[PDB]
Symmetry: D2
């Protein structure tokens, strides 16, 4: 009777807040993870303590390669194995690091374009081929047109994800699958980043001079998958505190 | 007094009514603004006050641009403060819509099309902010703003100006904690060829579907969202010619 | 015969550079001005001294009012009275100043900021089209239209409206062979009013050379758009901003 | 000292026209090709007959693979070996075919994302590493109103927008400008029946025809010229208003 959702990169940070808030809403969840095995299992434990048999984990590398289609097929298949259905796909997993124009480059291309764009395409195809309020939500980037300097590949990946969001909204609408995006500006800052750099970014945000909580991002995801967004497809909701509006 | 309060312009019919109703159902007190639709405005106010008495008032004003528009807009915001003691939400919904081919005087067309669609929203936004917790404004935009209807230059200029206001006001009022966002319908309630162009189910949006996006944006679930415009268009804007 | 162009606010700065560059390419020019009468006449003189009977001036307030349509009709009429034709319209004139949401009356500011930046371009476009070869319109837009200066809401509304006009008019006049495009400076000639230190703050933002656009660089893009090399281009807005619009906060 | 330009996919159609018009402006050219050797060589011969030793050909597959970075480095190097310099890169080559959601899919990924996005990135990096310098990328005016069932193609073209913007921003301190030209409907497929061609043509507000190759080429010539010295990160539509037309 309960719908089911796949969330990629759901062990930590935003994806985890997404999976949690989906579960709170009624969904059974596949918690996809790559390296964060302890966190993934520990999230699924917490969720199944609340409602037994409502969470499973699924391990996969989302780097592009000739087995990526199979991995993506397996993420979707795992949702069907555990819950008999797959109502929502959340494309959240993401590699993020600089690739200056001036790891081999082909690995960087595989990681940054694979995770951020190719895996979402492949997951979207498998989601669709396996098929009610069906929908996909892609995690985009509010700053996609005012990119971080030296992040060409990352940015290319997120731009492609906009393209996917739109193309798949158009193509899947006849099957009643909605496809939308949520575009954070500055949400949870990289664990790697020092606290002076974190406040630099925080200070740019017109609304409150702080980053988005992961929960604030999830809230937008929840709206998009909900029955209050039934006529919404191809839309990318910025959740950025106005940051994208701010000139240099 | 702890129930928040909303002003919705053009609230007597169609999308504005639906927005007023849904806000009221969420627990808002509402100012139902109207220009010509007195009977309808009052009838809605009646229905809502039957649900919860003294939660709905009406306010008449022409939103055409003129020398008296700033005072009319200021009095709309005042009416919310008079009735309810606070003004938490402004929904800029009223809109004039008609062709103005490039090939009523043109200056009257400017006054109604740019006035109702952009200038009144600007003035209402100014009065709303001057008078000031989850404070927000929602502007009713247009999903087809960049693929406009042929011969609708002034309407389109006004809806583009409204994107501008949405973004400018979001930036400038963020320090006051006033969020400013937009909802952009495609084809909603018609004023069949059109229905068939929509990817998502070959139908128009109900007014309620538009309202749903407004309710989201005013909610505590959108507390970090400002300067965003959510399309509610069933994919129509994605469809090439 | 030589083609003819109208340039609004052409007495000084970017408008002058546009009129000059159009005249150098072979156009006869109407130099529209509002307050800058000495500068406009002085410009027409210089151009006429390079080639007789190729420049006139035309004074008009482009503030919105009930007479704005007549004024815009008269601008276009001036070009047909002077040159027997009107091939190109450059909507360059612009009022620019803050209008904080939180001096002049607000209705005056609306009239100036929406009138000059949007309404007069719409009426001029209407007149240009109705009074009718490579016919085109170029609207001076703003590359920062989606990252606006704080407290510039009416100016920004006007520049957004002008984007809309650009697109609506390109759509609607394409059947008549009239192209409509835009040119969108980021930081070009800074306000005369602005102190050097404030100017250098803006300059420092620009990735491409950390300087503002020259007036000539803006004009070059106008000249492309009116040219035979832009015959298939309509509804395009070209940023001339040295990458400024791409820079995050 | 004549400047030098690399044009990818320069043997035919839009790329050919770009190469010709660059050559007419005074550029020496590297005509890059994949399968169209005879057309590429005939263009080179034509251009050399006009001015000796001003055109060379360079064969390379721009599909993504382990060797694409070396291929892209070789293209750029061929310009320097032939002409002693490389002033302009035009990323024009493109694969284009439907990839419905409902060749292996990874080969589709390699061809569509490789030609349209990864190869321009690699080329751009090699161009920059080796340094009026500018790059022009051939984008798509319909990128936000895509053809149904062209997700991978559209993804590639959106990525190219991101490249164009990202490279503009990063390369601006080295004085390298990076821009795009976005055709709407230009030269239609070779096989497409006229009746199908006319459905597309009829959609275009400005003259109900597709853009010539030369018309697209004109915008590229503008962007590489001294008249665009402050233009970077700009994408000029050359679409006859098509992108403005609602469904
Ligand atoms: N945080 C922000 O400020 C911000 C800003 C703009 C956009 N976003 C977007 O919002 C989404 C969530 O953001 P976030 O900061 O929570 O992301 P994140 O923590 O940087 O990454 C989320 C997860 O992606 C997974 N991932 C990385 N490489 C992968 C690979 N090769 N295969 C499979 N999974 C891989 C990781 O899983 P394991 O941990 O299991 O390895 C990781 O925990 C992302 O799409 C991001 O680009 C975030
Ligand atoms: N329905 C759609 O397909 C669609 C598409 C795109 C955008 N939108 C936007 O969605 C919003 C609501 O759409 P709708 O179809 O419900 O609107 P609508 O029925 O065209 O107009 C709504 C109300 O605006 C008020 N209004 C019109 N001219 C006025 C004036 N001079 N002064 C004061 N009020 C005036 C009227 O109030 P009185 O009746 O009291 O005189 C009218 O009932 C609008 O902003 C519209 O532009 C709608
Ligand atoms: N300068 C920049 O950095 C920059 C940046 C972004 C966009 N732009 C745009 O590029 C264009 C040219 O810029 P600019 O700096 O050269 O412009 P500007 O000097 O601010 O103004 C140009 C001319 O506009 C005319 N004007 C102002 N108010 C008017 C009115 N009420 N009636 C008629 N004319 C009026 C004036 O004519 P008189 O002198 O005769 O009175 C003035 O000389 C403008 O459209 C502007 O918005 C410029
Ligand atoms: N034609 C249009 O209406 C239109 C519309 C929108 C955008 N565009 C863009 O404008 C540009 C030029 O258009 P077009 O119609 O002239 O292009 P096209 O004829 O489809 O492709 C141009 C060339 O791309 C090369 N190419 C294809 N796959 C390749 C690979 N794997 N490796 C290396 N080269 C490869 C081919 O070279 P060989 O022949 O040598 O094998 C081909 O001649 C493209 O970027 C296109 O996407 C065109
Ligand atoms: N996977 C990720 N995508 N984008 C991210 N943004 C992290 C930020 C870095 C600086 C401001 S936000 S993590
Ligand atoms: N007031 C109004 N603004 N925009 C409106 N759109 C109504 C249309 C719906 C479908 C084609 S036109 S009404
Ligand atoms: N009329 C005018 N519109 N925009 C102008 N730009 C002037 C600038 C002010 C700050 C940076 S550029 S003048
Ligand atoms: N490589 C190519 N990219 N885009 C192309 N477009 C050809 C067509 C344009 C419109 C219908 S088919 S070829």
């Amino acid at each position: 009777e309960a719908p089911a959702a796949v969330v990629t990169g759901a062990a930590k940070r935003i994806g985890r807040a997404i999976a949690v808030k989906l579960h709170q809403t009624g969904y059974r969840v596949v918690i996809h993870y790559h390296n964060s095995a302890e966190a993934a299992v520990s999230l699924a434990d917490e969720l199944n303590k609340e409602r037994s048999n409502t969470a499973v984990v699924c391990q996969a590398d989302l780097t592009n390669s000739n087995v990526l289609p199979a991995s993506c097929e397996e993420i979707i298949n795992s949702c069907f194995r555990a819950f008999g259905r797959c109502d929502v796909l959340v494309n959240n997993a993401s590699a993020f690091y600089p690739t200056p124009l001036v790891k081999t480059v082909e690995t960087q291309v595989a990681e940054l374009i694979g995770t951020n764009a190719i895996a979402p395409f492949l997951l979207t195809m498998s989601f669709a081929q396996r098929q009610s309020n069906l929908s996909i939500v892609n995690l985009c980037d509010a700053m996609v047109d005012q990119p971080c300097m030296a992040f060409s590949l990352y940015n290319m990946g997120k731009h492609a994800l906009v393209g996917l969001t739109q193309s798949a909204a158009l193509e899947l609408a006849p099957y009643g699958i909605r496809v939308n995006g949520v575009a954070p500006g500055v949400s949870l800052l990289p664990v790697a980043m020092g606290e002076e750099e974190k406040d630099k970014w925080r200070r740019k945000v017109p609304l409150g001079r702080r980053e988005a909580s992961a929960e604030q991002i999830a809230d937008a995801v929840i709206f998009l998958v909900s029955g209050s967004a039934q006529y919404i497809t191809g839309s990318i909701i910025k959740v950025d505190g106005g940051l994208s509006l701010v000139h240099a």
